């Protein structure tokens, strides 16, 4: 076929195609069942003010393309223009009085220290088995710590969120640090680089400069445990600026 | 929060709804006791 004539045919063909589209039914079944099957479309983009055709495509795949999509390991992306602009344009968005320590703060610090993670990377509304990688030795090691720290635990504590599990301890717990947290703060000052000044001399600096009594003193030390520096810092003067940022 | 998160989007919504409905019955006893 010569492209001069090929042109002429297509022109004529399309002309009656539109003329007679007008007065003959929309066979949108066989439309859908061509680009979904005969082309294996990985991404449909509905250009329109409402996701009408998105819905029509979405529910066609729900009905008869369950067995077919899984059989090809074919991931499908359904997008409308109006709703799903950001995926199509590729422009996502960036996204002083003394008080005994809370169980909610102490719980967060014991979990954050064991996971080697920061004091804000852990959200409180999350179960213990969730924010662990299912390691389980890490899981029961945390539960082993909470047994030492608070004493009596609820039943399956690793299935109730830290936010929910905080108030349960808060009732029977009051101020006094105890076994596990003291031993971790025993390491924090000893293993790191308050080289000259021990626990007692570190306590008096918070009480003198900032004006924090015993209850407030412990809470600042727990934040320092979650923000453990781990680099061999030199003198007292750097270690004073460490306790300043933690306060 | 779990209402307002899912309301933005119907299974596992009525189960949040009668959970906060039940807490209002217990809370109605508390301030009556107060």
């Amino acid at each position: 076929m010569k492209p001069e004539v090929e042109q002429e045919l297509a022109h004529i063909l399309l002309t009656e195609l539109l003329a007679y589209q007008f007065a003959s039914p929309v066979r949108w079944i066989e439309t859908q069942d061509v680009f979904l099957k005969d082309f294996n479309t990985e991404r449909v983009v509905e250009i329109g003010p409402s996701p009408t055709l998105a819905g029509m495509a979405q529910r066609t795949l729900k009905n008869k393309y369950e067995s077919y999509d899984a059989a090809l390991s074919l991931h499908r992306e359904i997008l409308c223009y109006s709703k799903d602009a950001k995926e199509i344009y590729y422009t996502p968005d960036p996204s002083i009085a003394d008080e005994p320590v809370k169980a909610s703060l102490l719980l967060h610090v014991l979990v954050a220290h064991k996971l080697k993670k920061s004091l804000d990377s852990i959200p409180m509304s999350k179960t213990i088995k969730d924010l662990v990688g299912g390691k389980s030795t890490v899981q029961n090691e945390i539960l082993g710590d909470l047994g030492k720290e608070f004493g009596t635990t609820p039943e399956k504590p690793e299935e109730t969120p830290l936010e929910e599990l905080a108030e349960t301890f808060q009732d029977t717990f009051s101020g006094a640090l105890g076994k596990q947290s003291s031993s971790l703060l025993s390491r924090l000052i000893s293993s790191k680089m308050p080289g000259g000044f021990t626990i007692t001399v570190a306590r008096k600096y918070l009480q003198t400069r900032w004006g924090l009594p015993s209850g407030r003193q412990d809470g600042v030390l727990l934040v320092a445990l979650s923000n453990e520096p781990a680099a061999r810092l030199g003198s007292e003067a750097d270690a004073k600026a460490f306790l300043d940022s933690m306060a | 929060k779990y209402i307002a998160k899912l309301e933005g989007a119907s299974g596992d919504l009525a189960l949040y709804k009668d959970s906060v409905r039940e807490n209002e019955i217990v809370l109605n006893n508390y301030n009556e006791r107060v």
Partner: protein, 768 residues
């Protein structure tokens, strides 16, 4: 002279070996049965090596090959060809691009050309660096293949500039260059004298012009030939005055995709085996120490492949086909047992292809690898919405920002004012209740004549009638007024163009941002159909498009007699087959609807086959529509499971019963106030403000005026075959757009077109 390598049989063995060496675990390179094994684009170096590396060997290119530095390696899949299958026999063809003497040493650029069954498949581009001090200017040259440059000729000055250029040799001197599109396929030979001054500039190649018939023809030669020159005049001319075929468009903000840790192996032995890069400086310590290196280094080409595997993973979603062009700059060298930290950024688009830019650092936070990756969009289908959903100021947020949007609306709006004497924008933004068109002045007259010439065809008791729209409008008319109850925006001769504009506008923004694949398939629901064609194949101008869509709305408004006020005896209703009964299917509606129209005699038919067993639309007689919603109200309240007693209990006593069930709803709905208010019930939902049974057989009559109007606004030299073929899916013939006999036949079987049948009768116009 050209270097050719041995034809290379790809084996299931050699790919499997190569993947484990580099650590590419992508699904496409694993022997799953049925779905053959692919070979990576990295694997080309294994094929290419024997030819490519030969380029640096001759006596005239004299270098200490110990102090060679692998600078950059680039792959480029030619457009259209599929990547390497397991069964492929691959011919290699290595051409050297550039030998150049710089102060610090000599740069060698090599261009491999892999061949499958005689077709080019991909270009392998390697740059190599001999360190030292070379006065080798005689054996120093630059034979490049410049990319294709295209010029749009618009003005009488663009032509006059080209006529001033000696190297613009035409075959026909008189040839008309006005409003044409020249494409320049250019290569250029250069020989040197100094590090800066060229001894011989030679630039040539054919000059093709874009024809209306989609294929180009060569009627022009570039013939530049100089002596002692400084730069290539011809290329710099085409940079500024023309443009490339493909335009890169940066995002507003680059997106960090991922930051990943790929590690170098303990030894370079396993890569050396599969690659054929047995270079001793990678493997033997004493050789390494002789080259003044900090020990046995990891292969350049290992690092390239390793990073590419993550690019393939994290940007192409575990698919080998999508990655189109990968280049890799080697900044510094890499030791075994090192921890490479590669950051991946999606930075830009080029006509529906993503630009990936990556950056790999070691432990010491030193730049090691940079490069670019052209990656395809997934397989894409654009589907354009139909009527129904239209609010005040729809897509006006997009009009304010996008330059491309501003183009679409305004150019249309300028036509609406200059031809039909209103602002379509005014309509969208304000949604007025009454609009008055005035025909005063010479310009007013032309608009009035444009309202006159509108026609339609309805069957009036006897025969056809070529009655015109707007009976009020004559040669003595001064005003015509458009009247609505709520606003003109919901009166369908305004709804339709606005909807069409919004969608087209949206598209052209995406096209301007280069978010449109070349190989995208497209269709549109009823109206969107038109927008789709204007969008993806430039079938009509914006000018010619909105004209038709406007005329469509007009012919739809009048085809039904609606005497009383804005109230006809026709309408349409949306049905949910699932709501009435869990067994009620397609094949249940095709009985009920066909029977209600055969029994009553009143026309009712299915017009929208949208969602299977969830969303269908029936249009026709409002009396016949009140029956169907009541018959479907009856089967939902009985809930007498249809598959149990369809043919299993009462064989064709359904026809007796369905009638009995019809004739107590049929003879109940015939005694209603004449233009009957329709209500909703349990499955059938009425489409509000829809008064016309469009897509029914009723309006087969008024096509000859609609066709003849399409013929004026769709010119033959505005229809690209290539940009429609197996991409366009109409609504009439839900099969890919193909120009073949079986397609023409399938249309006429539904249509009854005399212009179509006169083509099938002599399909022997293969001979011009």
């Amino acid at each position: 002279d050209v270097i050719k390598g041995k034809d290379f049989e790809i084996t299931a063995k050699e790919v499997y070996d190569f993947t484990h060496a580099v650590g590419n675990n992508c699904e496409d390179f694993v022997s799953r049965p049925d779905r053959t094994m692919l070979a990576p684009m990295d694997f080309a170096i294994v094929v290419g090596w024997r030819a490519i590396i030969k380029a640096i060997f001759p006596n005239t290119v004299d270098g200490d090959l110990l102090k060679l530095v692998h600078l950059s390696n680039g792959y480029k899949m030619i457009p259209g060809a599929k990547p390497l299958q397991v069964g492929d026999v691959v011919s290699t063809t290595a051409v050297i691009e550039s030998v150049v003497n710089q102060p610090t040493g000599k740069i060698v650029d090599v261009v491999g050309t892999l061949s499958r069954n005689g077709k080019p498949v991909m270009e392998v581009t390697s740059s190599f660096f001999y360190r030292g001090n070379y006065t080798d200017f005689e054996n120093t040259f630059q034979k490049t293949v410049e990319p294709v440059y295209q010029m749009h000729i618009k003005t009488s000055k663009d032509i006059a500039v080209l006529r001033s250029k000696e190297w613009f040799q035409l075959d026909d001197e008189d040839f008309d260059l006005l409003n044409k599109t020249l494409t320049f396929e250019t290569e250029t030979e250069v020989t040197f004298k100094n590090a800066n001054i060229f001894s011989s500039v030679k630039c040539f190649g054919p000059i093709k012009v874009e024809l209306p018939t989609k294929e180009t023809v060569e009627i022009g030669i570039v013939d530049y030939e100089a002596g002692a020159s400084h730069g290539n005049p011809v290329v710099d001319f085409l940079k500024r005055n023309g443009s490339t075929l493909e335009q890169k468009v940066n995002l507003e903000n680059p997106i960090p995709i991922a930051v990943l840790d790929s590690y170098t192996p303990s030894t370079n032995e396993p890569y050396a085996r599969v690659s054929g890069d047995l270079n001793p400086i990678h493997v033997s310590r004493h050789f390494a120490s002789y080259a003044n290196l900090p020990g046995t280094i990891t292969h350049g080409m290992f690092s390239s492949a390793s990073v590419r595997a993550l690019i393939e993973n994290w940007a192409a979603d575990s698919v080998s086909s999508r990655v189109r062009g990968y280049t890799c700059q080697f900044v510094d060298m890499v030791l075994p047992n090192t921890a490479l930290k590669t950051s991946i950024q999606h930075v830009g688009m080029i006509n529906g292809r993503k630009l990936i830019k990556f950056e790999t650092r070691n432990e010491d936070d030193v730049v090691v690898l940079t490069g670019e990756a052209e990656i395809e969009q997934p397989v894409t289908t654009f589907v354009f919405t139909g009527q129904g959903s239209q609010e005040q100021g729809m897509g006006m947020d997009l009009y304010k920002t996008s330059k491309a949007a501003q183009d679409v609306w305004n150019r249309a709006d300028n036509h609406f004012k200059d031809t039909y004497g209103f602002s379509i924008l005014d309509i969208v933004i304000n949604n007025p209740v009454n609009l008055t068109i005035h025909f005063g002045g010479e310009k007013g007259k032309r608009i009035r004549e444009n309202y006159s010439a509108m026609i339609f065809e309805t069957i009036v008791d006897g025969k056809l009638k070529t009655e015109k729209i707007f009976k009020e409008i004559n040669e003595h008319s001064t005003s015509y007024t458009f009247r609505s109850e709520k606003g003109l925006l919901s009166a369908t001769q305004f709804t339709q163009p606005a909807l069409t504009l919004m969608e087209k506008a949206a598209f052209e923004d995406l096209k301007s941002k280069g978010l449109i694949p070349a190989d995208a398939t497209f269709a549109g629901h009823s109206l969107g159909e038109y927008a789709a064609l204007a969008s993806l194949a430039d079938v009509m101008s914006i000018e010619s498009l909105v004209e038709v869509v406007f005329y469509r709305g007009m012919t739809m408004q009048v085809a039904v007699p609606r005497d009383e006020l804005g109230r006809s005896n026709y309408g349409m209703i949306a049905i949910n087959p699932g709501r009435v009964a869990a067994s009620f299917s397609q094949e249940a509606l095709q009985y009920v609807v066909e029977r209600v129209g055969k029994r009553t005699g009143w026309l009712v038919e299915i017009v929208n086959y949208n969602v299977e067993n969830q969303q269908y639309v029936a249009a026709g007689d409002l009396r016949a529509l009140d029956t169907v919603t009541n018959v479907l109200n009856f089967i939902k309240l009985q809930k007498i499971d249809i598959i149990e007693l369809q043919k299993s209990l009462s064989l064709e006593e359904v026809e007796g019963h369905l009638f009995e069930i019809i004739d107590e709803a049929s003879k109940k709905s015939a005694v209603k106030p004449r233009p009957l208010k329709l209500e909703r019930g349990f499955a059938c939902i009425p489409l509000v403000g829809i008064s016309v049974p469009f897509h029914s057989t009723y309006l087969m009559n008024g096509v000859k005026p609609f066709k003849s109007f399409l013929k004026k606004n769709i010119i033959k030299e505005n229809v690209k075959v290539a940009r429609l073929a197996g991409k366009y899916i109409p609504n009439l013939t839900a099969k890919p757009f193909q120009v073949t006999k079986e397609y023409f036949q399938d249309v006429y079987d539904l249509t009854g077109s005399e212009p179509i049948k006169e083509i099938i009768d002599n399909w022997e116009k293969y001979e011009q």
